[PDB]
Amino acid sequence: MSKIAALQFPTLALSESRLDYYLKASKDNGVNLVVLGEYVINSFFTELLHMPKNMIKEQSEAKKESLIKLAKKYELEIIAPYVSVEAKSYKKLCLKVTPNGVKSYEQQILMPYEHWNEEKFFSNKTPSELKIFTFNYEKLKCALLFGFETHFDIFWQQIMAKKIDLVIVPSACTFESKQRWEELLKTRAFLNSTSILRVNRIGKTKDEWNFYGDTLFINAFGEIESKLGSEEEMLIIEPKKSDEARKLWGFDKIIKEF
Template structure:
C-alpha cells in the first residue's frame, strides 16, 4: 500500500490547497502530516484562547474528513483541540467515515518548550498501547516524535506485532543526525518501518531562529533510510508491502 508523507509548514489548510496535492495521491493511500501543521507551533498558540483553538481544529478536521472521503484516503494528522477550559494534543486518524484519536502519552517538559504543563493530556507513569489500525494487511501505529525516546512504548509496539510506526514530528535545532539514528535503531530493533513526517518552517523568539528542517523519511527494518525529503515543501510517496516487512521479521527474529 502507499504512504504519502506531506512535508509542510503550518497551513491555513484551505481545502483548495490540499486538494491540489491530494489529487495526485493514489487512492487508498495513508497521508501523514507532521506536528504543528494543522495548528501554529506551540509557542505561537500557547497564549491563544482555548475555545478558539478548538474551533479552528474542528473546522480543519471537518475539511480533512471531506477530503479523506472524496479521495478514499486515510489521513493521519496531529491536532490541538479540546474545549474552553482544557486543550489536548492528539493525533487524528481520519478515514472519511469516522475519526479516531491517539492522545500523546508523554510530552516535552523542557524549560524552553514545556508542553506538559500547557496541555491537559493525562499524566501516567505507565504507557498504554498506542492506537493501531490495520490496512492492506499491515498493522499501523501512530506516535508523536517525543515518544520515540521511550523504550516502554516501543516494547508494547513490538509485542503487538506492529509493522509500520507513523512518527509525526516537529524537530528543530541541530538534531537531524540524532533523529535519523534513533529512527533507524527503532525500525531495526522492532523489525518495522518508521514513517517519519517532520514539519518545516521557522519560529523566531528574542532574535533566535528555530528552524524546522524537514528531512521526512522512511526507515526500513534493516536500519537503513529508504528515501527522504529535503528541507522544502514536498511530498514523499512510498509503497510498503507486508511481505517485504515479513522477510526482515523472519531474517532477524526480533519479534
C-alpha cells in the same frame, strides 16, 4: 499495492485549498493513507501560548471539518496532529480521519522542558500504563507514535510484541538534532524489525527555531529508503511486510525464549 503519502507542510492557512490539492495528488498516486506532521493543522506550539482560545479552536475545527469532507470526497485516510480545544483546557491529539468516522490518539508522553513545555500547556490524561495506538492499514499492522514518544523503550517493546510492520511518527524536529534523530530511528527500526515513517513540519518560528523537514522512511532492516529535503513536498512510500526482516535477526524469537 499499499502506498502512503507523507505531506511535509508548515502550519496550514485557514483556507483548505493547499490541502485539497495535495490530497487529490495523493489519491491520484494510488495512496489511501496520508500523514501530516506536528503543528501543521495548528500554529506551532510557541505561538499557541499567546493565541486566543477561540482562534485556536477555529483553526483546528476548520481543518477537522475539511479533513472529514476531503476524506469522504477522495476516499482516503488522513493522520494529522490536532489541538483539541476544550472548555477549560487544551489536548494534544492525533486524528485519524476516514470516510466512515474519526478516531483520535491522545499523546501519552509530552515534553516537559521549560522552553517547550507541552506537558504544562496541555491537559493530556496521564495514563497509568502506556499503550501503543495501533490500527490495520490494508495488509499492514501499523502503530502511531508522536515524535517525543519514540525515545521510550516501552513503546517499542509493545510494537515488537504486536509484530508491527510500520510505525508512523508525526513529529516536530529542529534541524540541530538531525543526525541524532536518524540514528535513533534507524536503530529503532533495526532492533524491532519495523518500518518507520517520520513526518516532519517545515518553517522558522519567531524565536528562530528551524524546522527543516527531513521526513524520511526507514525499512525494517534499519536502512533509509527515501527522505525529503527542507521544502514543502510530498513523500510517497510503499511499505512492505516486516516478516522477512524479522526472521533475519529474530530478535523477537530470542526474547520469546524466556
